[PDB]
Amino acid sequence: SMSYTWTGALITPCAAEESKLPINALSNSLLRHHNMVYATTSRSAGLRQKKVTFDRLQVLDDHYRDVLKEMKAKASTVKAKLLSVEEACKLTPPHSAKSKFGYGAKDVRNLSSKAVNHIHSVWKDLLEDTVTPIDTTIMAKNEVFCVQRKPARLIVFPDLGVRVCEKMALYDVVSTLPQVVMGSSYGFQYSPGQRVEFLVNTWKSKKNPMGFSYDTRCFDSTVTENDIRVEESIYQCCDLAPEARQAIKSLTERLYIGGPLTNSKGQNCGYRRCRASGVLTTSCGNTLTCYLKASAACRAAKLQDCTMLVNGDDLVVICESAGTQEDAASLRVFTEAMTRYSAPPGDPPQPEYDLELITSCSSNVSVAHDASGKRVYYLTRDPTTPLARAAWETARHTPVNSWLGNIIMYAPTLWARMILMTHFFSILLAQEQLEKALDCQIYGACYSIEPLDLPQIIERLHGLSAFSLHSYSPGEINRVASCLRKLGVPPLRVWRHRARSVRARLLSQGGRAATCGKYLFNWAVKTKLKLTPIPAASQLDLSGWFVAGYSGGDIYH
Ligand SMILES: CC(C)CCn1nc(-c2cncs2)c(O)c(C2=Nc3ccc(OCC(N)=O)cc3S(=O)(=O)N2)c1=O
């Protein structure tokens, strides 16, 4: 069937959009080639509409059905609980798009009677109606990039009332079933250090390791009604409260499978017959689907001893090599299978025999050295998009602080430490806003974070060695330096000098701000210290931090 049908109504913005990088007094201190940075807007939504619209055909064979039978057997061991309206409400972001029924996100979180009364009747309607398609809003994402211009990603999402109900019925399933079904292959269960650990141990576990990533063209569009149905049969394998089963079935038939698309102005835009990107189960269902197709494709291509790592639509496979040219032929057979399954490639997969050349979740493993000269593997990425985004956040306050999220995910990296930490801690000092909490996303879920808790969070996540890394690899140092040339970012030498200043200004304030100077910026001094564990770090509730993915999922912690 066609992934989408369109009436020709435009996808409309909910407010004023900017596409050129706003500039302020701080802008040039970070990035000077302002014209290489842009933000996607709703002005380009029509090209994405063309791009995500095509016919899917699926040919499902025994390898496909065998794997599914395996996954369901695992799924059968999962017990999930219904969440209460109250529990579901506190998972709602403070800033989540308001209902069309006279209440917003803060209404939800306060368990206000208007919100709770509406939520109860959506629930009841779900239990009493398994047919009537549920309405969705279609919007264009404003995301910041660097000239390669990409058209805007789209977001399709049901009303605030449906979204609370979704959590009641499926929050516990989507958090817990994926690890049980996919085991160590489920990606969102790992912190960045645990991901590096798994990749390395896996690579080492092969007699002759080969690895490749597989990038599907517009994954959401390739998801068919069969797929969304298949993943419901997985869910329904769980031990469930009868109200949960009924609601999951209802949400599957009415919403997950398909539904009408309405713009921010109230006009019908068309019909969806593929994955909606703004539903709770988006991440879990894409992960499951990508894992089923790929697993099944590993058998068609007779790839030997595969260890897959899947995060939504993002897939890396590490297997036993069969010889370079035979690996090349293998992957072509992998791709013909994936294609039959309705998941053809963007870029054709390539075999890699150097772990550090594999990109997965936009990231690669690299090596540096700790205080003792020990080799230590860490996760990193091309800093271009991080830097483009930080330029923007340098002038405009945004719903998500990518700089903050990147500091946490890439704390051990050359670029996060030397540039991101230096830049934004300088900004925060001048506004006296270190204790002001800021929203970032980690694995698609929203978190409110104090810049001041950074060294404690970084210690827990990556360990004290993130504050001591040095002697980075030549390829990593070159990729960073070269990105800086491209973007017009001061060279790493300038950052070091600025950081001695930021460090000094931080220690001057004493307390936690000083701990920030001490731990985050110890790399910037000759008279560097011994970094002992932070006392208050065990008091942090880092439970629930790397357990599941919830992108599109409207989840707050
Ligand atoms: C694997 C990590 C250790 C490093 C890279 N990284 N980084 C982040 C960051 C979050 N804030 C700053 S960076 C982050 O939130 C994610 C991340 N990974 C996803 C991957 C694939 C995804 O697929 C979406 C779908 N197809 O439905 C979704 C995500 S995510 O959960 O939004 N967040 C991520 O993978």
Describe the structure.
Its cofactor is Mg(2+). It is a single-pass type IV membrane protein. It catalyses: RNA(n) + a ribonucleoside 5'-triphosphate = RNA(n+1) + diphosphate. This is RNA-directed RNA polymerase. The modification Phosphoserine is found at residues 29, 42. The PDB classes it as transferase. With 557 residues, this protein is α+β, with helices and mostly antiparallel strands. The protein folds into four domains: 1-55 and 133-158 and 258-273, no CATH class; 56-132 and 159-186 and 224-257 and 274-280, no CATH class; 187-223 and 281-363, Reverse transcriptase/Diguanylate cyclase domain (Alpha-Beta Plaits), CATH 3.30.70; 364-557, no CATH class. 42% of the residues lie in helices and 13% in strands. The protein is built from 19 helices and 14 strands. It has helices spanning 45-51, 62-75, 85-90, 105-109, 113-128, 160-182, 192-204, 219-222, 225-235, 242-256, 282-300, 324-340, 384-393, 402-409, 414-431, 454-462, 474-487, 492-507, 511-520, and strands at 4-6, 37-39, 136-140, 144-146, 154-158, 209-215, 259-262, 268-272, 304-311, 314-320, 364-369, 375-380, 438-442, 445-449. The strands form five sheets. It has a five-stranded mixed beta sheet with strand order 1-8-7-3-5. Strand 9 and strand 10 (314-320) form a beta hairpin. The longest helix is centred in the first third of the chain and has 23 residues, at 160-182. It is globular. The chain starts with a strand and ends in a 37-residue tail after the last helix. The structure holds the ligand CC(C)CCn1nc(-c2cncs2)c(O)c(C2=Nc3ccc(OCC(N)=O)cc3S(=O)(=O)N2)c1=O. Residues 192, 195, 219, 282-283, 286, 311-314, 361-363, 379, 402, 405-406, 409, 440-444, 549, 551 line the site of ligand 1PD. Ligand 1PD binds at residues 192, 195, 219, 282-283, 286, 311-314, 361-363, 379, 402, 405-406, 409, 440-444, 549, 551.
